[PDB]
Amino acid sequence: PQITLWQRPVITVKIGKEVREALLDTGADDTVIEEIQLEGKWKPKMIGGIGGFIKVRQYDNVTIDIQGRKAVGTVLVGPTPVNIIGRNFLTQIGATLNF
Amino acid sequence: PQITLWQRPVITVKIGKEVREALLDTGADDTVIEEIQLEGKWKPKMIGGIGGFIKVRQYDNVTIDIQGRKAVGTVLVGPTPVNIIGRNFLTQIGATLNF
Ligand SMILES: CC(C)CN(C[C@@H](O)[C@H](Cc1ccccc1)NC(=O)O[C@H]1CO[C@H]2OCC[C@H]21)S(=O)(=O)c1ccc(N)cc1
Numbered sequence: 185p186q187i188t189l190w191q192r193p194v195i196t197v198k199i200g201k202e203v204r205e206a207l208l209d210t211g212a213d214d215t216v217i218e219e220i221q222l223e224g225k226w227k228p229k230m231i232g233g234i235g236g237f238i239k240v241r242q243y244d245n246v247t248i249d250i251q252g253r254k255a256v257g258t259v260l261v262g263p264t265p266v267n268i269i270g271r272n273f274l275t276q277i278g279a280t281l282n283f
Numbered sequence: 284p285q286i287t288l289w290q291r292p293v294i295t296v297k298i299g300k301e302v303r304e305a306l307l308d309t310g311a312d313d314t315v316i317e318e319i320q321l322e323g324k325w326k327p328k329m330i331g332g333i334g335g336f337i338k339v340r341q342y343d344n345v346t347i348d349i350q351g352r353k354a355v356g357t358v359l360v361g362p363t364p365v366n367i368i369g370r371n372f373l374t375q376i377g378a379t380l381n382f
């Protein structure tokens with residue numbers, strides 16, 4: 185779809201076979217979700233945003249389905265204020281910014 | 284243009300009287316710049332992100348030029364890690380997120 189930006193671009197997705205809502209975020213390098221258990225081993229990491237750093241659990245090779253588009257990649261789990269889909273998955277579904 | 288997301292969508296923009304670079308950020312409601320002299324009156328606000336809150340100065344009615352697309356609107360000035368153009372200006376330049 186073509187998504188205008190008069191409201192936040194929040195979409196329903198499936199992450200690791202769980203339905204979640206998330207913000208499509210071109211300003212995020214990475215995908216960050218709060219309170220989910222995913223497959224495989226995780227690795228601790230730190231990421232920073234506008235207000236400082238948070239600790240996250242990094243899971244690799246997680247499947248995300250965005251309106252029929254499947255991608256597999258890294259998901260960070262930690263106390264983000266809102267769930268975010270970042271560029272690591274937006275590139276895999278061929279998302280672009282257009283003006 | 285049609286901008287892919289394999290690298291951060293950083294573009295050059297003119298903000299008030301100053302050329303700056305900034306990140307095109309669909310996950311940001313508002314545009315936030317660090318250390319820019321803007322004219323007019325301002326009001327103090329906080330905004331929050333990953334990691335917590337920062338205190339900004341809110342300036343209304345600032346002119347930005349993005350690749351020839353001119354827009355007027357609110358700019359927040361404060362200690363953001365990187366400059367970001369948020370939806371309040373993305374909508375005004377006709378940007379959409381597509382996939
Ligand atoms: C500031 C960006 C360079 C980075 N962020 C993405 C950004 O889109 C967040 C995404 C975001 C969105 C909501 C809440 C927290 C974070 N937006 C944000 O902080 O926007 C602020 C300015 O406008 C306001 O509207 C939203 C909060 C304010 S980030 O959330 O900190 C971030 C950092 C690292 C990764 N991997 C993923 C995301």
Ligand SMILES: [Cl-]
Nearest residue numbers: 302303304305
């Ligand atoms: Cl700059």
